[PDB]
Design a protein around this ligand. Structure first.
Ligand SMILES: O=C(O)c1cccc(COc2ccccc2-c2ccccc2)c1
Length: 133
């Protein structure tokens, strides 16, 4: 029942500070503009020990599959090649991405009927709120 509170189909309803987060990450101007417009559908599923997160949007379609605690290689929507580890900490999915001696952490939590995504890169935080599709 791992991650049951997260499983389903979710749609972005609000974003704050995302352009600033993307700039801290190193995303270039054109990508930031187009990516910042996107309203993704996020699909989270669980099959045994394997979690799959898909993000579908007019910007990019991305999919990751992983086992908690077990590092994987991820190519991000903005084309970084990162090493990612996702863990469940106190009911929060914590996703750390490492590349070029940089790190960013994305946390996904359930709050009321929403799924709240917090993206942090050095001092800059963005909050993205999803509701059930
Ligand atoms: O809202 C999310 O599910 C979420 C989760 C985890 C991480 C991030 C951050 O991802 C991005 C990072 C850099 C540049 C662009 C993106 C990006 C922009 C639009 C759709 C998908 C990725 C968004």
């Amino acid at each position: 029942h791992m991650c049951d509170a997260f499983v389903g189909t979710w749609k972005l309803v609000s974003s704050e500070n995302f352009d600033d987060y993307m700039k801290e990450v190193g995303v270039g101007f054109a990508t930031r503009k187009v990516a910042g417009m996107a309203k993704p559908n996020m699909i989270i599923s669980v099959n045994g020990d394997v979690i799959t997160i898909k993000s579908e949007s007019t910007f990019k379609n991305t999919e990751i599959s992983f086992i908690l605690g077990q590092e994987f290689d991820e190519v991000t929507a903005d084309d970084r090649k990162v090493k990612s580890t996702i863990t469940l900490d106190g009911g929060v999915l914590v996703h750390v991405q490492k590349w070029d001696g940089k790190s960013t952490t994305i946390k996904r939590k359930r709050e009321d009927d929403k799924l709240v995504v917090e993206c942090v890169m050095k001092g800059v935080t963005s909050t993205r709120v999803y509701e059930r599709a």
